[PDB]
Amino acid sequence: MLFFSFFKTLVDQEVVVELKNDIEIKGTLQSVDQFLNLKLDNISSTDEKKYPHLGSVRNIFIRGSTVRYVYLNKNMVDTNLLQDATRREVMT
Amino acid sequence: PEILPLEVIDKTINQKVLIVLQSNREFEGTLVGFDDFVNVILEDAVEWLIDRNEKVMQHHGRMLLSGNNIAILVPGG
């Protein structure tokens, strides 16, 4: 439940998403779910080569199981909040 | 009069078992124990890779083999 909480505070913030199959996509995080699925509004191209076969599409749904990376800015995130929250989380 | 798979594995305890992964690799050893998930304890396992097949290692003591990757069990090797 912790990373769901993390991703909720990122709504309305531009993020880059790297999918396992080497697809990279810039977008505004509009929505997040329990599986960490993502909905990105105002889609844009970070890399020339990696970027897939889109165009008119400006809104996408990304399956959480297929993401490798979500690239953030250090100002989007309070580190100490993250740390104390991880410390709190129980893993058993 | 039904024959249950886990009863068959229960009977092969203290015998030699072949354990075949879903990959090429195989483990032959003495079946010490197993759980409900088919995690498995082997004693002095010979670890193989299969086709000329190279024998990876000779274990000594006890191995816990994750049942997550196990496709087949053969009783008495």
Binding site: - | G33, I41, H60, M63, N69
Partner: protein, 74 residues
Amino acid sequence: VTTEFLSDIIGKTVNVKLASGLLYSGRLESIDGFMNVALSSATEHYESNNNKLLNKFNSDVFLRGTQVMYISEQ
């Protein structure tokens, strides 16, 4: 019975193979029901201990459970 094993070998020197082939030799600090493993004084080798040493971690090593193919004592 597999749990009795998990607590029987804690503190002993083990080999932990992963899916990839990579093998880790260390002292078992801790284990969890998800097969997650903690080792200390660990080395990595590919397939066999007799092969070339690929790394020596002076620090503690956390190996993910989903990835472990066995844990074995020597």
